[PDB]
Design a protein around this motif. Structure first.
Motif, PDB file in Angstrom:
ATOM      1  N   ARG A 107       7.193  -0.853   6.433  1.00 38.09           N
ATOM      2  CA  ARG A 107       7.482  -1.927   5.460  1.00 38.09           C
ATOM      3  C   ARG A 107       9.008  -1.839   5.034  1.00 38.09           C
ATOM      4  NH1 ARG A 107       3.599  -5.396   6.568  1.00 38.09           N
ATOM      5  NH2 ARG A 107       1.143  -4.565   6.183  1.00 38.09           N
ATOM      6  N   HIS A 109       2.311  -3.355  -0.247  1.00 35.70           N
ATOM      7  CA  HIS A 109       1.345  -3.716   0.597  1.00 35.70           C
ATOM      8  C   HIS A 109       0.101  -2.693   0.623  1.00 35.70           C
ATOM      9  CE1 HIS A 109       4.644  -6.336   2.380  1.00 35.70           C
ATOM     10  NE2 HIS A 109       3.561  -7.005   2.817  1.00 35.70           N
ATOM     11  N   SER A 110       0.445  -1.638  -0.080  1.00 38.70           N
ATOM     12  CA  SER A 110      -0.567  -0.435   0.103  1.00 38.70           C
ATOM     13  C   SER A 110      -1.790  -0.833  -0.865  1.00 38.70           C
ATOM     14  CB  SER A 110      -0.180   0.924  -0.499  1.00 38.70           C
ATOM     15  OG  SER A 110       0.775   1.402   0.527  1.00 38.70           O
ATOM     16  N   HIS A 129      -8.588  -3.197   6.780  1.00 43.86           N
ATOM     17  CA  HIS A 129      -8.395  -4.262   7.788  1.00 43.86           C
ATOM     18  C   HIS A 129      -6.841  -4.276   8.127  1.00 43.86           C
ATOM     19  CE1 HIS A 129      -6.621  -7.681   5.679  1.00 43.86           C
ATOM     20  NE2 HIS A 129      -7.074  -7.431   4.677  1.00 43.86           N
ATOM     21  N   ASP A 136      -0.604 -12.577  10.158  1.00 41.18           N
ATOM     22  CA  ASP A 136      -1.247 -11.678  11.157  1.00 41.18           C
ATOM     23  C   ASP A 136      -2.671 -11.939  11.409  1.00 41.18           C
ATOM     24  OD1 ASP A 136       1.123 -10.228  11.502  1.00 41.18           O
ATOM     25  OD2 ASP A 136       0.647  -8.767   9.806  1.00 41.18           O
ATOM     26  N   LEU A 137      -3.419 -12.241  10.138  1.00 38.72           N
ATOM     27  CA  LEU A 137      -4.801 -12.534  10.367  1.00 38.72           C
ATOM     28  C   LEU A 137      -4.958 -13.954  11.199  1.00 38.72           C
ATOM     29  CD1 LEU A 137      -5.946 -11.624   6.928  1.00 38.72           C
ATOM     30  CD2 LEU A 137      -7.052 -10.982   8.789  1.00 38.72           C
ATOM     31  N   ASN A 156      -3.842 -13.331  15.139  1.00 39.17           N
ATOM     32  CA  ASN A 156      -4.876 -12.488  15.978  1.00 39.17           C
ATOM     33  C   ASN A 156      -6.449 -13.440  16.141  1.00 39.17           C
ATOM     34  OD1 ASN A 156      -3.136 -10.578  15.641  1.00 39.17           O
ATOM     35  ND2 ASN A 156      -4.162  -9.302  13.880  1.00 39.17           N
ATOM     36  N   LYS A 204       8.477  -1.890  -1.219  1.00 39.83           N
ATOM     37  CA  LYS A 204       7.340  -2.621  -0.351  1.00 39.83           C
ATOM     38  C   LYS A 204       6.055  -1.682   0.098  1.00 39.83           C
ATOM     39  CE  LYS A 204       8.508  -6.289   0.294  1.00 39.83           C
ATOM     40  NZ  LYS A 204       9.059  -6.628   1.987  1.00 39.83           N
ATOM     41  N   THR A 205       6.528  -0.401   0.228  1.00 40.90           N
ATOM     42  CA  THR A 205       5.266   0.453   0.870  1.00 40.90           C
ATOM     43  C   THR A 205       4.063   0.237  -0.095  1.00 40.90           C
ATOM     44  OG1 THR A 205       6.960   1.896   1.711  1.00 40.90           O
ATOM     45  CG2 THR A 205       4.581   2.747   1.789  1.00 40.90           C
ATOM     46  N   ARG A 265      -2.708  -5.383  12.457  1.00 43.55           N
ATOM     47  CA  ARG A 265      -1.319  -4.936  13.164  1.00 43.55           C
ATOM     48  C   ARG A 265      -1.408  -4.482  14.382  1.00 43.55           C
ATOM     49  NH1 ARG A 265       2.058  -7.236  10.477  1.00 43.55           N
ATOM     50  NH2 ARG A 265       3.657  -6.169  11.670  1.00 43.55           N
ATOM     51  N   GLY A 296       3.246   2.320   6.513  1.00 42.02           N
ATOM     52  CA  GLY A 296       4.198   2.402   5.388  1.00 42.02           C
ATOM     53  C   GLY A 296       5.511   2.352   5.584  1.00 42.02           C
TER      54      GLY A 296
END
Lengths: 841, 233, 50
Positions: free
Chosen positions: B134, A746-747, B171, A796-797, A800, A742-743, B176, B131
């Motif tokens: 996640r 999303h990176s 972004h 999240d977007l 906010n 998962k790291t 977050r 990181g």
């Protein structure tokens, strides 16, 4: 033309570096500019001289001044000498073979400190470039570089493989982990520079610019995130100058520890470490004294902490030398006496012995046992001359005159004189004459080894220049008193004959070889020529911007050379005073120029440390001689012309003798390597129930992902189209592997989306045709987790923007004025609203 | 260098310096060796007729013509000591920050970066802390640390978030952190912080753009659905 | 809002939004950023003898 090479170099005992003592008072190793000298302290004679080779002046010789030795370190057990040079080069020398073994080049500046490890297999080097590099002798490579400091490494301490402590000129003390190559702790040692560092057990002492000297306890194993180095106390040394070096020596029999603080001035201060019993005895006594004074216990405790340093250290003795001290080192430690050896800035070695008993020494001042002084001159040589036989060289310096045998290079006689400025041999090679700055004229006989006559009032000011006629019966002396005085030799004593008074100060007087012309330089930038027999004025050479410093007339009395402080050598014809040519010879003031006998070629030396050979007829530079480290003050040529002797500010007398894949193509390779590994590990995992990647130290998914990043976006879409379909299945297996991590997902989520969708669109028709069930599951898995990652970012977007809108709205109700009238409101909102200006056509 | 007539002159710091008073009302401290104005003191608005020094000028007294005294005291060593102590503390903070980053103690390194004001290190703390997340917002310890932040720290952090929000490549870290702030702070307080609104005004337009994107990425991802349905045929 | 020059002198801020304080930057990075700054601007009797 013929080539000039450095036949010999002598007159240097101790240059700008440290001294290394080796037991047999034993021998001493000391630097001599580019060479290293080994001295026997008892006899005071040079045991051996270390020269790498490549004598100056050879065709293969380099075109720059040689790098001088800066630091010397020898491992006694292995008999290896490590020599650091001003240019950042380390050479490992075999003492027995007197040859270079290794050559390390890792520093961009002068090396400040070298230290062998305990086992002698690794060398740690600190240099002015602020870097500490640890070298491997058996491996002949630099293991790693420590790059935290921001100025010259003044000192460092590494007795253990695991930690290192370093000190630098920026005032920082830093603890290093040799196993991680990182700085663990950082503290400000002093308000400014930090110069000294010595460590004995936990005790650590450092010196700053001022007399303040700090004490730190070294708790290596504290491991608290801090406190490995903590400040104990401050003690003030008597000398207000900076402390350069600190060294510990321990007496084996009595376990007593002593250390010195080598100051910048002529003082070395020795200290004794009090034993624990002495400290406890002292602490109790001072408590009794201070309690007797009536102070409170809390004050007593604080005062004890304030006076903490006094308990451990005891000022033992101070060594005072006549000359400024350059370096020092402990020689021997014993119950009877304590011995030290030091090198001065004035080119001499001093051996100091301290007899002592219990707390304090026996004698008020140390006993100077040995000195090496005969083979060098303390002050810079201002003038030199060579005897007619070309065997004896006379060198006149401030306070002393020394005479050398050109063959053996050894000083024969030494005479004490004033501030000598000029020296020349009289005919026969048995006498020497001097002009001192105090206006005195001194004459010496070599056989008697004593001064015959001194003329105190020869001149009212400095005798800048002195010359002899070819017959040798007459002397011409020029001085700053604006006069020239003629002297005669009558049986030996000098009688003043005639005075010629000029309008300005005199800098040089030269008499022609045929004795017909007397050329004299003046401080008004003019050189006057006279007729010696009649003293009738002949010519006034003009055109030097700065005063002429040296004059020399050709062997035929036809051509005359003038070298001035304006860096120009001007050549003139004596027939008419016409200037043949002006040469911009050197980069600094040119001090002396001499004709080669029976020829028009001439030599020139300047303050830039370069001696140049010129052609007197073609007016071209023949050879450049780079051997000296500083200003060359004097020059002399043999009567036969065989060799030339030059003396410089470095106290050295040198004798010169005449002898690909494209985007997409790379990605396909990345997929082959990575997915072969992923498939192999998967198949290996199924059963139980490469060089490239290990070298780069990355996982298969990371390796493919990085290759994707390197591809430019303008090339990416074209890169993907080139892949065959078989690699698209490979690509779709790669993305599936990314989804678990998962790291990574999303990176690089936007990048992964763009490439995946383009791949599916481009060859959609072939993908749907395939009936592979495993493929259908991969796309299902790739789809679901791809959505959740995208939805997670989207939520999240969305959260906010609605939250931040609420924050804006509430502030408006509280701090935004409101008009009930709409028209008034519109005018305000226009003014409050942000405005931007645009160019319009 | 004096605009008007000089009416007093007195040496201070032994031979080193000279102080002079002028009718303009300005006191200038010069260097005797170099003859240059080192410092200018302006505590008056009229001509000065008196200038008294004591202890080699360690304390200087000057009177205005109006009747105002300015009692000046030397503080060079006092200022230097403050700078030395501040530098000593700053050095320890830097070294501690580096150690935490190597060990990965993000909850601690986050605080140091906020105090030292190291935006790049602060970004790395949040990026590689995210990181690990996640594998609520960031983690239990670091979420609490953000909550304790005072008004000044919130303004500083939100300024970084505004800048980070502008770039589409960074972004995600910004949103977050903004998300963490809103859920662990009183929104009533956030509004009243002076200048928080103008920072908020810049954040929203960029946030909407990022929301318009990503949503389109969701639409594009349904090509996988159209791929799967075709295969099932 | 356009991310522009840093308000604090010690801080360096770029158009991409990356901000670096001068204290944290290593020396090799300071020289690198300084060079990058250059290119962007360019597009737009006793004494003498002795």
């Amino acid at each position: 033309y013929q080539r000039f090479e450095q036949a010999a170099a002598f007159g240097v005992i101790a240059s700008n570096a440290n001294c290394v003592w080796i037991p047999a008072p034993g021998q001493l190793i000391t630097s001599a500019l580019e060479d290293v000298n080994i001295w026997d302290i008892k006899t005071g004679d040079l045991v051996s001289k270390l020269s790498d080779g490549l004598p100056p002046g050879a065709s293969d010789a380099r075109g720059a001044k040689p790098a001088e030795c800066t630091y010397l370190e020898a491992h006694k057990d292995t008999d290896l000498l490590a020599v650091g040079y001003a240019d950042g080069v380390i050479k490992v020398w075999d003492l027995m073979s007197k040859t270079v073994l290794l050559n390390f080049n890792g520093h961009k500046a002068a090396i400040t400190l070298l230290q062998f490890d305990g086992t002698g297999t690794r060398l740690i080097s600190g240099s002015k470039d602020s870097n500490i590099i640890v070298w491997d002798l058996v491996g002949e490579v630099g293991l790693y570089k420590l790059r935290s400091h921001k100025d010259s490494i003044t000192g460092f301490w590494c007795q253990g493989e695991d930690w290192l402590i370093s000190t630098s000129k920026d005032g920082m003390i830093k603890l290093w982990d040799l196993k991680t190559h990182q700085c663990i702790e950082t503290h400000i040692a002093h308000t400014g520079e930090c110069w000294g560092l010595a460590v004995k057990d936990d005790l650590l002492i450092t010196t700053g610019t001022d007399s303040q000297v700090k004490i730190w306890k070294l708790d290596i194993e504290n491991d608290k995130m801090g406190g490995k180095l903590t400040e104990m106390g401050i003690f003030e040394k008597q000398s207000k100058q900076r402390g350069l070096k600190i060294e510990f020596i321990t007496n084996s029999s009595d376990k007593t520890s002593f250390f010195y603080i080598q100051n910048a001035d002529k003082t070395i201060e020795t200290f004794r470490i009090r034993k624990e019993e002495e400290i406890a005895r002292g602490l109790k006594k001072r408590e009794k004294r201070l309690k007797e004074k009536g102070l409170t216990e809390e004050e007593i405790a604080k005062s004890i902490k304030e006076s903490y340093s006094s308990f451990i250290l005891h000022p033992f003795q101070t060594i005072r030398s006549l000359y400024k001290i350059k370096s020092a080192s402990w020689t021997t430690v014993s119950s009877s006496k304590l011995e030290l050896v030091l090198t001065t800035s004035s080119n001499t070695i001093e051996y100091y012995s301290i007899p002592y008993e219990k707390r304090d020494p026996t004698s008020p001042a140390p006993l100077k046992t040995h000195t090496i002084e005969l083979q060098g001159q303390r002050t810079d040589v201002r003038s030199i001359d060579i005897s007619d036989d070309n065997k004896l060289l006379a060198t006149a310096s401030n306070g002393s005159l020394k005479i050398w045998n050109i063959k053996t290079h050894k000083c024969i006689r030494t005479f004490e004189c004033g501030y000598a400025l000029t020296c020349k041999f009289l005919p026969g090679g048995l006498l020497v004459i001097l002009g001192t700055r105090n206006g005195e004229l001194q004459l010496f006989d070599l056989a008697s080894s004593s001064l015959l006559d001194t003329i105190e009032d020869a001149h009212d000011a400095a005798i800048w220049s002195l010359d002899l006629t070819s017959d040798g019966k007459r002397l011409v002396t020029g001085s700053a008193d604006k006069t020239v005085k003629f002297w005669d030799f009558k049986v030996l004593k000098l009688h003043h004959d005639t005075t010629l008074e000029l309008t300005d100060d005199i800098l040089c007087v030269r008499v022609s070889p045929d004795d017909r012309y007397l050329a004299i330089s003046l401080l008004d930038n003019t050189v006057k020529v006279f007729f010696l027999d009649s003293m009738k004025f002949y010519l006034s050479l003009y055109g030097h911007k700065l005063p002429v410093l040296s004059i020399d007339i050709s062997f035929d009395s036809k051509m005359i050379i003038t070298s001035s402080a304006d860096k120009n050598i001007k050549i003139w014809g004596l027939d008419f005073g016409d200037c043949h040519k002006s040469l911009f010879a050197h980069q600094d003031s040119i001090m002396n120029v001499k004709f080669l006998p029976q020829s028009h070629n001439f030599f020139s030396c300047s303050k830039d440390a370069v001696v140049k050979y010129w052609d007197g007829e073609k007016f071209e530079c023949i050879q450049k001689l780079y051997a000296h480290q500083s200003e060359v003050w004097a020059l002399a040529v043999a009567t036969d012309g065989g060799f030339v002797v030059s003396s410089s500010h470095d106290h050295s007398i040198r004798i010169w003798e005449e002898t690909s894949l494209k985007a997409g193509e790379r990605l396909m390779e990345a997929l082959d390597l990575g997915i072969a590994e992923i498939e192999g590990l998967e198949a290996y995992n199924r059963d139980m129930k490469n060089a490239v990647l290990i070298a780069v130290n990355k996982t298969p998914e990371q390796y493919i992902m990085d290759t994707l990043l390197r591809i430019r976006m303008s090339q990416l879409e074209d890169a993907l189209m080139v892949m065959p379909f078989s690699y698209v299945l490979k690509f779709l297996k790669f993305i599936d592997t990314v989804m678990q991590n998962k790291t990574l997902l999303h990176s690089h989520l936007p990048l992964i989306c763009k490439n995946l969708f383009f791949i599916i669109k481009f060859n959609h028709k072939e993908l749907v045709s395939q009936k592979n069930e495993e493929l259908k599951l991969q796309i299902n898995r790739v789809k679901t987790e791809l959505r959740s990652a995208l939805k997670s970012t989207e939520d999240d977007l969305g959260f906010n923007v609605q939250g931040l809108k609420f924050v804006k709205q509430q502030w408006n109700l509280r701090h935004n004025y409101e008009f009930v009238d709409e028209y008034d409101q519109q005018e305000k909102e226009s003014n409050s609203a942000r405005k931007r200006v645009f160019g319009t056509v | 260098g004096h605009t008007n007539a000089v009416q007093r002159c007195s040496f201070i710091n032994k031979q080193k310096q000279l102080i002079s008073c002028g009718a303009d009302g300005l006191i200038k401290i010069w260097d005797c060796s170099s003859g240059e104005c080192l410092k200018t003191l302006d505590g008056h608005n009229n001509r000065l007729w008196a200038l008294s020094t004591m202890n080699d000028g360690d304390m200087i007294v000057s009177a205005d013509a109006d009747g105002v005294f300015q009692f000046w005291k030397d503080c060079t060593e006092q200022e230097i000591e403050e700078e030395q102590e501040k530098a000593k503390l700053q050095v320890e903070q830097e070294q501690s920050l580096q150690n935490y980053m190597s060990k990965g103690d993000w909850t601690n390194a986050f605080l140091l970066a906020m105090t030292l004001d190291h935006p790049m290190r602060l970004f790395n703390v949040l990026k590689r802390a995210l990181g690990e997340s996640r594998s609520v917002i960031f983690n239990e310890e670091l979420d609490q640390a953000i909550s304790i932040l005072n008004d000044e720290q919130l303004i500083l952090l939100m300024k970084r978030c505004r800048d980070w929000n502008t770039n589409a490549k960074t972004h995600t870290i910004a949103q977050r952190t903004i998300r963490c702030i809103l859920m662990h702070h009183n929104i009533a307080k956030l509004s009243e912080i002076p200048g928080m609104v103008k920072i908020v005004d810049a954040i929203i337009p960029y946030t909407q753009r990022h929301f318009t994107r990503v949503d389109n990425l969701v639409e594009q991802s349904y090509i996988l659905d159209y791929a799967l349905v075709e295969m099932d045929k | 809002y356009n991310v522009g020059k840093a308000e604090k002198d010690g801080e360096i801020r770029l158009k991409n939004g990356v901000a670096m304080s001068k204290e944290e930057l290593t020396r090799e990075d300071k020289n690198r950023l300084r060079r990058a700054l250059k290119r962007k601007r360019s597009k737009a009797s006793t004494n003498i003898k002795l």
